[PDB]
Design a protein around this ligand. Structure first.
Ligand SMILES: Nc1ccn([C@H]2C[C@H](O)[C@@H](COP(=O)(O)OP(=O)(O)OP(=O)(O)O)O2)c(=O)n1
Ligand code: NA
Ligand code: NA
Ligand SMILES: [Zn+2]
Ligand SMILES: [Zn+2]
Ligand SMILES: [Zn+2]
Length: 327
DNA sequence: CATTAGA
DNA sequence: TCTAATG
């Protein structure tokens, strides 16, 4: 957790690099399992040779570990770190819509900067266009102060559209959190469930609503069950206009809501742990449902769920209030 | 690990 | 269709 800290971080930086800058999935993959095991390795590593003994750790990684221990640094690491090429890639990827692939490509075109990015909006697609158009706000955190107004607004319109709807703003916001990155709204209607062959409009209605009253500014993407947009609190009585924010709206079939809700509320730690327990308790949890375990190694049979509570009950747990879903 | 764009 | 991107 800190006893092998440096080692693990160098290794991540290392891994990271193969994957984006170059394209060595392998190596990249190589670095992570290694950094994965050494992290667990409950003993302060004094040498490579020692590390080496680990699984995933081969000749190469050890070597690095040696120099890293020996001298407070790593050359290949210092070099990369400097190297404009790699730097440029890491950077471009910052724009919503820019992945490594494209990052790589732009660079080899000579698009190392945001300015360049501008001068070539032609080479960008819409996602990426919008991305650049809000690069700054994109990086900005969401003061919960803001999260509450936003939430407020969403709920009202949903409501007006159809009172049958069921929305939930999940995430960290849901778990107390002082800020959040983007808003995730969980969505399901009663007329939509596991069987009933879709209802696209079910989603499309509100997407339009919200958009109708200027909360929705732009559309990153829009499916029949998932919508990726850009919203924004109305700039009051002028002077303090609000930063553009990432929002994702999702249609879930009524019968698998709370699992989804449970799920989305996280935290990963509550998850895995909420997950580790359901197993002992004779089950299985997932992003959508919860099925009883059967001794033949496994089983199915998606249990009926009416609320976050139900699941707890199921795995006979203690209802943990969202605020305390922190682990 | 799933859903949407895109070319 | 595949391949990229966000989640
Ligand atoms: C997993 C964690 C959440 O359940 C969901 C993804 O949500 P985000 O990636 O938005 O993560 P958080 O809500 O935890 O972070 P943020 O502070 O960005 O909202 O899947
Ligand atoms: Na990006
Ligand atoms: Na392939
Ligand atoms: Zn020891
Ligand atoms: Zn989020
Ligand atoms: Zn999100």
């Amino acid at each position: 957790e800190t006893l092998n800290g440096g080692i693990t971080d160098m290794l991540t930086e290392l891994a990271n690099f193969e994957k984006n800058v170059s394209q060595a999935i392998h190596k990249y993959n190589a670095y992570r399992k290694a950094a994965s095991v050494i992290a667990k390795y409950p003993h302060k590593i004094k040498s490579g040779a020692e590390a080496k003994k680990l699984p995933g750790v081969g000749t190469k990684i050890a070597e690095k570990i040696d120099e890293f221990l020996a001298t407070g640094k790593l050359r290949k690491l210092e070099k990369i770190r400097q190297d404009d090429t790699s730097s440029s890639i890491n950077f471009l990827t910052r724009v919503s819509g820019i992945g490594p692939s494209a990052a790589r490509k732009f660079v080899d075109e000579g698009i190392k900067t945001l300015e360049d990015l501008r001068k070539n909006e032609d080479k960008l697609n819409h996602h990426q266009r919008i991305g650049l158009k809000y690069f700054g706000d994109f990086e900005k955190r969401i003061p919960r102060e803001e999260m509450l107004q936003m939430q407020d607004i969403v709920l009202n319109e949903v409501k007006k559209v159809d009172s049958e709807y069921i929305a939930t703003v999940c995430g960290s916001f849901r778990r107390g959190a002082e800020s959040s990155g983007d808003m995730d709204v969980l969505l399901t209607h009663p007329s939509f469930t596991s069987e009933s062959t879709k209802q696209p409009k079910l989603l499309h209605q509100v997407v339009e609503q919200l958009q109708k009253v200027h909360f929705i500014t732009d559309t990153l993407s829009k499916g029949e069950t998932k919508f990726m947009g850009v919203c924004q609190l109305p700039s009051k009585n002028d002077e303090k206009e609000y930063p553009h924010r990432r929002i994702d709206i999702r249609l879930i079939p009524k019968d698998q809501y709370y699992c989804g809700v449970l799920y989305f509320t996280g935290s990963d730690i509550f998850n895995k742990n909420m997950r580790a327990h359901a197993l002992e308790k004779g089950f299985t949890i997932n992003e959508y449902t919860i099925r009883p375990l059967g001794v033949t190694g496994v089983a199915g049979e998606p249990l009926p769920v009416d609320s976050e509570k139900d699941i707890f009950d199921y795995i006979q747990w203690k209802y943990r209030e969202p605020k305390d879903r922190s682990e």
